[PDB]
Amino acid sequence: SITNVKYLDPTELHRWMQEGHTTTLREPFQVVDVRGSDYMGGHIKDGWHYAYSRLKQDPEYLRELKHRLLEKQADGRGALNVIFHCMLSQQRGPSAAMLLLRSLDTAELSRCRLWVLRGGFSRWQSVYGDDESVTAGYLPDLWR
Amino acid sequence: SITNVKYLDPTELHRWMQEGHTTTLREPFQVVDVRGSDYMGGHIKDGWHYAYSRLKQDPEYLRELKHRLLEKQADGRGALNVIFHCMLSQQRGPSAAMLLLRSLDTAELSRCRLWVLRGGFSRWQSVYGDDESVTAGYLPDLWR
Ligand SMILES: [Cl-]
Ligand SMILES: [N+]
């Protein structure tokens, strides 16, 4: 085998956002921010917020996230690039990716490409925070 | 000449790790994992992680790897056996080996023996992924 979750750099996600799709295959993507208590202060524009603490405790919440991702994929070309992140993408981001992975059948996983955003929202804001076109709800004072 | 870079079987590397030195000349060795995005899910214990993408982009990072390898070679007996690998060892592992090779001057090269791990971490995982004594951070869910 090879692996079914990989890292994605903020610079790549940013390019995809600028271009409207992944660059090479022109595939759709969807950011999933899994922060709970530290979500405030900014998030990536157009991402979905499903706190990992709830996804892990609430099976219907995980089902909803999976449904929503599969539905979006059915509407687009190729595989849907799902990008999980939390604050650092060290614990919650990767755990949430694996929680979704475990819930995907073979047919469903082949419809997706699963990513963790390297560095989390912390790294994202450091270069992209101020740009309201890619970052929603940025509170620069929260980062002093 | 004969060649400066060759493939090494993962069975041989595992033996070197158990015994603590190479088989014929009892030389030291150092694993260099050059995966970037697909590093997630496990790696060889005690290896160093220098993504090929960064090694190519940032001469200072390449200079760091070289300086670190040469300082370790100074700390041991005989040539240091440097084992590069990536996921499949078809492209990045060999290109990384060649980047280092090109940076090494005459005497530096004499102090090293360069290897690429046949089959990459993909092959390693299939046989040793479960063995926590030789594999660190393994995430079986990623290899389904
Ligand atoms: Cl939402
Ligand atoms: N080379």
CATH code of the domain containing B125: 3.40.250.10
B101 lines ligand 2 (CB under 6 A): yes
Dihedral angle over CA of A67, A73, A79, A84, nearest 10: -50
Q: Which residue of B has its CA nearest to A117?
A: B37
**Which residues are registered as beta bridge partners of B48?**
B32
Q: Domain limits at A9?
A: 1-144
CA–CA gap between residue A19 and residue A67 (Å, rounded):
26
Q: Return the residue whose CA atom lies nearest to atom 1 of ligand 2.
A: B98
Q: Write the CB contacts of B33 (distance below 8 Å, at least 6 apart in sequence).
A: B39, B43, B44, B47, B48, B49, B50, B85, B86, B121
Resolution in angstroms for this experimental structure?
1.8
Q: Which pair of tokens denotes residue A39?
A: 């979500």
How many folded domains does chain B comprise? 1
Chain A interface includes B12 (CB < 8 A): no
Q: Which residue of B has its CA nearest to A97?
A: B142
CA–CA gap between residue B20 and residue B28 (Å, rounded):
7
Integer-rounded Cα Rg, in Å, for chain A is: 14
CA–CA gap between residue B7 and residue B51 (Å, rounded):
19
The angle, 0 to 180 degrees and rounded to 10, between the axes of the packed helices A10-19 and A120-128 is 60
**Which residues are registered as beta bridge partners of B116?**
B7, B84
Owner of token pair 């899910």: B41
Chain B interface includes A24 (CB < 8 A): no
Q: What is the DSSP letter of B104?
A: -
Q: Write the CB contacts of A96 (distance below 8 Å, at least 6 apart in sequence).
A: A32, A34, A50, A52, A55, A56, A84, A86
Owner of token pair 């539905």: A71
Chain A interface includes B53 (CB < 8 A): no
Q: Write the CB contacts of B76 (distance below 8 Å, at least 6 apart in sequence).
A: B27, B28
Alpha carbon B4 to its chain's center = 15
Q: From ligand 1's centre to the CA of B10, what distance in Å?
A: 46
